[PDB]
């Protein structure tokens, strides 16, 4: 019947044909192959055919993508395929869900954390020289923390509260930073930044308050051994700074 190869199927998913994929389950089970595998995958980066998917959008839409999530769980393959990392000159360790993120499909995130992505799937910084120069926009890795840096809450509340899988707000990246660190790090003292960054903050501060109280999400340190408020400080970042110090002056006279 119908043949299935790697510019076949990349050639269906980037135009976001669903009728194309029509025989790819049967081809698959008929041939013992999987959407993982070395054949399917681009050679130069590792992605499967998801992240071509979500990386070609008509309107925020590929309707091939619900088609995939379904014939690789029907391959016995649906967690690998969703959790299969790519690497590009920036990033190693990237995953559908983080484009899914930064294309900002909330659709998408959804669909794939209700199918096992994994929430806190680290995309590390890549770097050429002895010590990091860090040609790579920082956002802290992580899902969670790349949601908060991109300013989508409704995404940052979906991830910690939905009921399949949950990001933890607690989580540090690679360099110890949380979500709150993160924040500083992307912080550049524009009117814009410190508006959406403090909103952000406060918004991961009440949360953090809901679901873990004993926890204060301020004082957790990264590796340099920095709160996000002394990072803050020594990066410069004032009104962020000036943000997490009235707040805190703010906090204490109401319990007292």
Same mark, same amino acid.
């Given at each position: 019947? *119908? ?29 013992? *192959? ?62 559908? #869900? ?47 923390? #790349? ?86 400080? *020594? ?22």
């Amino acid at each position: 019947m *119908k043949v299935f190869n790697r510019p076949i199927l990349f050639d269906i998913v980037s135009r976001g044909s669903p009728d194309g994929l029509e025989g790819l389950l049967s081809f698959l089970l008929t041939h013992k *192959k999987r959407l993982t595998d070395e054949e399917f995958r681009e050679p130069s980066t590792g992605k499967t055919c998801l992240p071509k998917a979500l990386l070609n959008l008509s309107a925020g839409r590929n309707d091939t993508i619900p088609i995939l999530l379904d014939i690789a769980e029907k391959t016995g393959n649906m967690r690998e395929f969703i959790n299969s990392p790519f690497r590009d000159v920036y990033y190693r360790g990237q995953t559908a #869900l983080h484009i899914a993120i930064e294309r900002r499909c909330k659709h998408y995130v959804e669909l794939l954390v209700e199918k096992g992505a994994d929430v806190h799937a680290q995309a590390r910084g890549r770097f050429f020289q002895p010590k990091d120069e860090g040609g790579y926009f920082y956002f802290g890795e992580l899902p969670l923390s #790349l949601a908060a840096c991109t300013n989508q809450p409704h995404i940052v509340h979906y991830l910690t509260e939905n009921g399949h899988k949950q990001a933890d707000l607690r989580r540090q990246d690679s360099r110890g930073n949380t979500v709150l660190h993160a924040l500083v790090a992307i912080a550049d003292n524009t009117r814009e930044n410190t508006k959406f960054v403090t909103k952000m903050y406060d918004l991961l501060l009440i949360k953090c308050a809901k679901l873990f109280p004993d926890t204060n999400l301020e004082a957790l340190l990264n590796n340099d051994g920095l709160s996000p408020l002394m990072m803050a400080a *020594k990066t410069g970042k004032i009104g962020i700074f000036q943000h997490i110090i009235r707040r805190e002056i703010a906090d204490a006279a109401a319990h007292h």
